[PDB]
Design a protein around this motif. Sequence first.
Motif, short mmCIF file in Angstrom:
data_model
loop_
_atom_site.label_atom_id
_atom_site.label_comp_id
_atom_site.label_asym_id
_atom_site.label_seq_id
_atom_site.Cartn_x
_atom_site.Cartn_y
_atom_site.Cartn_z
N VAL A 1 -18.53 -6.82 46.35
CA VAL A 1 -18.10 -5.54 45.78
C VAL A 1 -18.47 -5.51 44.31
CG1 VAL A 1 -16.19 -3.93 45.34
CG2 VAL A 1 -16.22 -5.28 47.45
N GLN A 2 -19.24 -4.54 43.95
CA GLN A 2 -19.75 -4.37 42.60
C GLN A 2 -18.74 -3.73 41.68
OE1 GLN A 2 -23.24 -5.28 41.95
NE2 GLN A 2 -22.37 -6.37 43.69
N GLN A 3 -18.92 -3.95 40.39
CA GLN A 3 -18.18 -3.24 39.38
C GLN A 3 -19.19 -2.16 38.97
OE1 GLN A 3 -15.71 -6.26 36.58
NE2 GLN A 3 -16.39 -4.34 35.62
N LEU A 4 -18.98 -0.91 39.42
CA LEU A 4 -19.89 0.18 39.05
C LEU A 4 -19.77 0.43 37.55
CD1 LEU A 4 -19.46 2.39 42.19
CD2 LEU A 4 -21.60 1.29 41.39
N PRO A 5 -20.90 0.71 36.86
CA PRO A 5 -20.81 0.84 35.40
C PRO A 5 -20.06 2.08 34.95
CG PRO A 5 -23.00 1.52 36.16
CD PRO A 5 -22.28 0.93 37.35
N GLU A 6 -19.64 2.08 33.67
CA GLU A 6 -19.11 3.25 32.97
C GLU A 6 -20.27 4.26 32.94
OE1 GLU A 6 -17.73 3.15 29.02
OE2 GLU A 6 -15.99 1.86 29.46
N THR A 7 -20.02 5.52 33.27
CA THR A 7 -21.10 6.48 33.35
C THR A 7 -20.70 7.86 32.96
OG1 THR A 7 -22.86 7.27 34.82
CG2 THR A 7 -20.68 7.00 35.81
#
Lengths: 348, 348, 348, 348, 348
Positions: free
Chosen positions: A188-194
Amino acid sequence: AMSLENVAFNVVNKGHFDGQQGEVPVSIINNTVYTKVDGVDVELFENKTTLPVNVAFELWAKRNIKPVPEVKILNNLGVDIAANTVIWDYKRDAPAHISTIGVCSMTDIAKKPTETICAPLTVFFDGRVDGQVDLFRNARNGVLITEGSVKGLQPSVGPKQASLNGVTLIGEAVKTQFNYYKKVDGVVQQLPETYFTQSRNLQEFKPRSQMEIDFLELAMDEFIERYKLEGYAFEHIVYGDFSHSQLGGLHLLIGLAKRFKESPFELEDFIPMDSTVKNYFITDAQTGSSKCVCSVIDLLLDDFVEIIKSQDLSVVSKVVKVTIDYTEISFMLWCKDGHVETFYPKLQ
Amino acid sequence: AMSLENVAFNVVNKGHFDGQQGEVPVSIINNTVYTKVDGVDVELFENKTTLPVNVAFELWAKRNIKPVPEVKILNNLGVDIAANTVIWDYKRDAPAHISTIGVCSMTDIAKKPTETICAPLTVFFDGRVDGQVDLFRNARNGVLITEGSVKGLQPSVGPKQASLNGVTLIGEAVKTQFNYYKKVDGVVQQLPETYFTQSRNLQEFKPRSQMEIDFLELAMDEFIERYKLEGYAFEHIVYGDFSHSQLGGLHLLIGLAKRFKESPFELEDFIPMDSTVKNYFITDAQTGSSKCVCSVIDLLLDDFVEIIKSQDLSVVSKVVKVTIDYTEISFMLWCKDGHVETFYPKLQ
Amino acid sequence: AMSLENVAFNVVNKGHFDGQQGEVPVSIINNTVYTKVDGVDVELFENKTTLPVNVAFELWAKRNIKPVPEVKILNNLGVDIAANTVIWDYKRDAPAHISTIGVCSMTDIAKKPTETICAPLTVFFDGRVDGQVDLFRNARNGVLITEGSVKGLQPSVGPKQASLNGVTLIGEAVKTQFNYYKKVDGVVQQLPETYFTQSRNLQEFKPRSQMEIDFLELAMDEFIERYKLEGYAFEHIVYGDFSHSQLGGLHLLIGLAKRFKESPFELEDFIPMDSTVKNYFITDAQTGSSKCVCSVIDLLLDDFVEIIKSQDLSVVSKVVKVTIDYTEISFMLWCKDGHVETFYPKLQ
Amino acid sequence: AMSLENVAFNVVNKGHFDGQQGEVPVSIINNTVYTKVDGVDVELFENKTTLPVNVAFELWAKRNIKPVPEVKILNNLGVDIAANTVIWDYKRDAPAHISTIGVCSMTDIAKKPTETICAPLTVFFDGRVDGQVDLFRNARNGVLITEGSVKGLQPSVGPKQASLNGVTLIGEAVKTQFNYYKKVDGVVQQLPETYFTQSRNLQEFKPRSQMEIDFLELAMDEFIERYKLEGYAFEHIVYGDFSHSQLGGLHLLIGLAKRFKESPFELEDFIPMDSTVKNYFITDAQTGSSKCVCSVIDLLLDDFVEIIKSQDLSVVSKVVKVTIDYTEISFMLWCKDGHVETFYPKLQ
Amino acid sequence: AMSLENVAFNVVNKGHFDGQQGEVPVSIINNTVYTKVDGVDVELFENKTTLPVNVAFELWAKRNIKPVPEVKILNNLGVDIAANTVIWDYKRDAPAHISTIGVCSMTDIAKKPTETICAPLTVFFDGRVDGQVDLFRNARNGVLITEGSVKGLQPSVGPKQASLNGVTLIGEAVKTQFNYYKKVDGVVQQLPETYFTQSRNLQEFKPRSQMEIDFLELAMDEFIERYKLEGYAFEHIVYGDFSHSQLGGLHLLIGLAKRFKESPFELEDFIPMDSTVKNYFITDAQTGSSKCVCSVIDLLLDDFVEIIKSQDLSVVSKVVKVTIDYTEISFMLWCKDGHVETFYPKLQ
Ligand SMILES: Cc1cn([C@H]2C[C@H](O)[C@@H](CS)O2)c(=O)[nH]c1=O
Ligand SMILES: Cc1cn([C@H]2C[C@H](O)[C@@H](CS)O2)c(=O)[nH]c1=O
Ligand SMILES: Cc1cn([C@H]2C[C@H](O)[C@@H](CS)O2)c(=O)[nH]c1=O
Ligand SMILES: Cc1cn([C@H]2C[C@H](O)[C@@H](CS)O2)c(=O)[nH]c1=O
Ligand SMILES: Cc1cn([C@H]2C[C@H](O)[C@@H](CS)O2)c(=O)[nH]c1=O
């Protein structure tokens, strides 16, 4: 028991494929599907895809009719295929993905996303369909959207808007803001701040902040004065310079919308597909000022102001990378004497 | 429960439509139907008709696979449509008739030939199918074929040959000689006394009488001498005159076959369809003698000799009408001093 | 630096793609590629594939021009894709495989077979190309052909014949008999003991044994007597029964070739692709005897005699499985009172 | 008063365009022209050209039906357009020239060859049409054919053969040997002394001299002995070497015809158009010997023997230029120790 | 080193052909050019021309992107071809000229306009490109546009407007008013005195004089009164008569624009091409008044008033010839008792 005549029956009676039994007579001529009504041929579908006409007709009849992530979001997240649905790309008039899973016999690579062919692919999963959150938990690669919490999984709040039958909207009667999750090789990824693009149209552009209302109502000099934007080249970047043969700046959709109110212009969408940054061959009708490749992004004016005000302005030229729609967007930043000259989404 | 995928299943598994249940994935691209085999597309049908590809594929799969009358016979008898079958024309690679009855939803004008739409049309009926003799008695217009007697109906003995899957043959394992019956405006019509064309090819021409064997083996002068044909212009009409730029005579297929043994020639079939008399643009390769419209008929040489020997030769020019294949064929007879100059199936 | 104009330059000057630099003007109209010669358009390629015309033209120009395994062999071995070559199927006028590796940018799934996308696919490797034996040892799934030994790898002697530019032949100036190797899931698989089909045509059929010469020269009863085949129903299975409306037996190509010498017949190849067993809709021209699905195999008559003589004949009906061309062919064996009634490649 | 329906009337009734008045109903679907016969569509023309279907149908109907020079001769003489006729190329199934003069409104650049647009173009003139010799005298650029003398114009005796409706023949009932005349920039040009190709087929090859009869009947060593051809590498050049993977020599059509009698081979005509020298991708079926670009010329064996015996054999490699069909054909002559190694029409 | 893949690379990266090196994978399907983006096909170009798709794509990518004369001006000046550019006709979605010079290998008749093939053609020259004024000086036939003076050449002031990427505009950031020059057979012409059409749209019509502002703001009777237009039938000619089944007059675009403000109407552009006078099949939605051929011209109302006031009104019917856009426009003038009844651009 899938068939062309059954898909056509569903389109005619249900407006789309709805799993109903029945058959209507069909004729295929060139790239168009017709059906007989009152003794004459009525067009049901014209193929704009590179797939065989009967195949494209079936995937289009089986398109997802719930609010779904805009294709640019799915593309930016590396989605390859969807689990048991078709994400129809209304901008390309074609399926967003080459293959299917449990949708159509001609395009299916599998019936279920648990088949080994799917493990290397980033499968799109929809938490609103029973069992799909669990399928994502067991999938090696995937992107999951949900309306609420998933136990143990830290979410990424997606954009406010979603596409419902090709209409991008912020849902009032339906939920369009999803939680996003992503797994890469079982992790499970840590999706970036976007940041997120706003997905607005030029014809029906609406401001979504007090700054955006002020940009559209106020004159250039008083807006720049009110928001302390002196030295950030908004005159060039956002408002646009139409005084020379080459159209200067004009990279934010809000600026194109403000110009559109005064006078019209041609926007040639030479690569017609949904993308975070769009490139247009623009010709201003009033002045004749034009630009072959004018990169345009629709960011909330406040977000664009935050991005530009957060840069070091002491170098002639550099690449500024900003995460927008989960993807890394490169911008070229040109400065002189501590002030911005231009700032635009990089044409590479 | 007809469907494209079901027709394709039948073609793949049964060699034609056989009423079997099942579906195969199909792709349509342009005018061709494909199916997936070993991961790649395999062509099942190329549409050579003016119908939509999928419609033409269904009529072709549903073509009659029993020995049926040659299309030229059906055309000469005024057949418009067939009852619950498709007569496929193998020379045109298309259905012999525009519409169908109980065959395909796109082409059907009716499900049964008893429907009022069929009454004005000459419907083809097959006595080998249960109930079709009764349907012919109830039909206002029709043509019926049977293998035996129909009580009270006076028969017409048809040609010895029939077409089985596009192969014209005199049946040994199957019956190809039918009794013919015809009705116009609810009244059974007396079919005329008729000759029949032999339906032979130039490449595989075979003699069917001692006279025909003698024509192919003997030299021109000794054949004409043996059969007392002096004065009947067989030298021009049957053998052909290749001495001038315009090819003289050559109107009997047997003469073209005799010439073909010695030297080749081009035959342009400029109206490619089965007919009692065929018109060819012929170019003789040995001499360069040619003719834009050379009418050719394949009659048994004995039948042609009987026809020509049964004419009055005392007039310069007259039309000689001969019933061949149930149709009246007009021939132009040119005479001089009690001898034939030329005799040919009269050009229109 | 691949391009349509460069592929066309290669076709015009080298007869195929030969890696040469250069460009010729091309025009694409519908599914055909043309080039200008003497001021007029000359056809270089007509696309008969389901790929875009320009893509199909490139794969065709890049087809393998060395003797390669016949497509039926590759299909039977489970080949999905070829390493850095195109196996062109001359019976389908199309690429034998959907995708490519290091061949064409539109069809490539990878540039090298070592890329992870290739691991699940059975990649065809050619030991005659430098490095391809090593690529096979590193591949998870694959089929390898070589002209000689590979150290430590147990070989399977393939058929004597190979396809060279669509001509199936037993090489005299080139080697056509390869050693075959196969891997499934990273493990070399033992290829089974197998018979091989002879790949002969009906028009140019040649016997390849004294038994086959005797079958073609001798009369039915004296051949069966000479080879002690009484009770094996060769009269039905091999010679064929043309006495009833349904054509009896006729499942060995040699029997069709013997019949073809006496009289012609129509063979409708309704699934036109190379396969170990072929299904034809046959119509005998002499008798009118026909069969919708007549399975035909071209085995050496000695091999077929060995197969049939090696069966237990004490059961009414049973499936007899015979490895032919590396695939298991199911035959239906029908017996009565210790004698064969029929034996045929079992229809599905 | 030209029209599609009038051209179709002419084709149906006259076999080609014959200036007759009348109209037939026509339907155009895709690239095919159909007409209604017995209630169904019958194909009159399938467009294989790059012109619009209806335009191509008209030029085809208006094709020259007299013996005309073979397209390779016209091309070699630099013909660009024909005066008031269409030279149809039967090998390309298309007009030999892009434009027309007084033929069809869509392709006409002029109605008469005296119009200034025609002056720079080499116009083909036919002395058999009234006034065309006069038009050639007035033309700035042109090629004229006649059956006899033109006062004051020095003639060039052309080939014995001409094409009549796509059949290449030496006329017996018609004249096929023309006198040729050519003008460049208003000045009559002296046509060079030339050999002529024989225009024979492989399937129906016939010898045209005692030497050619001896080549086909005699064994290689006794033919070479009889005609004193030792040292001229006929074993390689004419007979062909099939012992290696690359097919050696085989550049004279007569040698291919001798080989064809023993065993078959594939000849891929990769640039399909009439030319003095043809290039084929050949694959020998017996041996597997092949060659991507095998240049083949059909010269009378005596003419080829005269050419090769008239060369100096003391140089390793040189270009030998021979006028054939009015064009200069470059041949590559390779020698060693006063003997020929190879001699072939030089590849470009 | 031109190629389809290189043109596509330029379109994708530069918005048009920009001479850049690079290649993108392309697929051609039917009349559409696609490129792969994110694994899926994206449409780059759909062919609306009669040229082959790849050829039209190249000419469109190579279109002139500077303000150029509107096609109607070039056509009226007899321009046949352009020097080293493509004038794209945005109204026909096709190249304005059949052939090219130094643009594309498939359409080029020459690489430079100095080649003898160009001398008879009227070549378009652009003084804004280095050396083109000099090329015009040396050209036998041509039309030249410049932004300023050419030594010794007397200029013709062209229209204020030009077309920039299909947008007709009066340039503010770019120059759109050109000086025009024309040579016919080596002689510099005196271009005639001419009016110019205004090239306005109905949807965005803007007045360009006080008279035009008064026509749109004032009521019919007070405008005619203010400008002393009594007796000139402006009620019929300009305002339009919608009281009968046949729509009366309505030949000036300004009148259609005034009507359009009140109520809509259908304008069928049945010959869709740029021309000085346009013909429309008009149907008024409010009244149902219609006219099959309604000729419409967009002249400045002052220019139309000058034209009509400069005619003799003493004849029932006569042709009035007016030079507009350098071409002679015939108008029919109908009078009665010294007053205009109608005046319209002649339908001939
Ligand atoms: C009816 C129809 C639809 N489509 C596509 C266009 C839109 O993307 C979408 C609209 S529901 O589906 C076609 O491509 N052809 C059609 O005929
Ligand atoms: C396979 C096939 C057949 N046909 C027609 C041709 C013959 O008339 C007949 C043969 S069964 O059916 C087509 O038209 N296209 C095809 O592909
Ligand atoms: C010239 C050409 C070839 N092909 C295919 C047919 C054969 O399978 C093979 C022969 S080299 O290539 C086409 O499909 N179209 C063509 O035009
Ligand atoms: C009937 C027909 C002819 N042609 C061309 C082929 C030959 O070159 C020549 C033969 S008369 O004309 C076509 O192209 N299509 C046709 O249908
Ligand atoms: C993208 C595209 C453009 N065109 C033509 C239309 C206009 O004339 C002009 C617009 S730049 O180019 C096509 O014809 N098809 C296309 O797809």
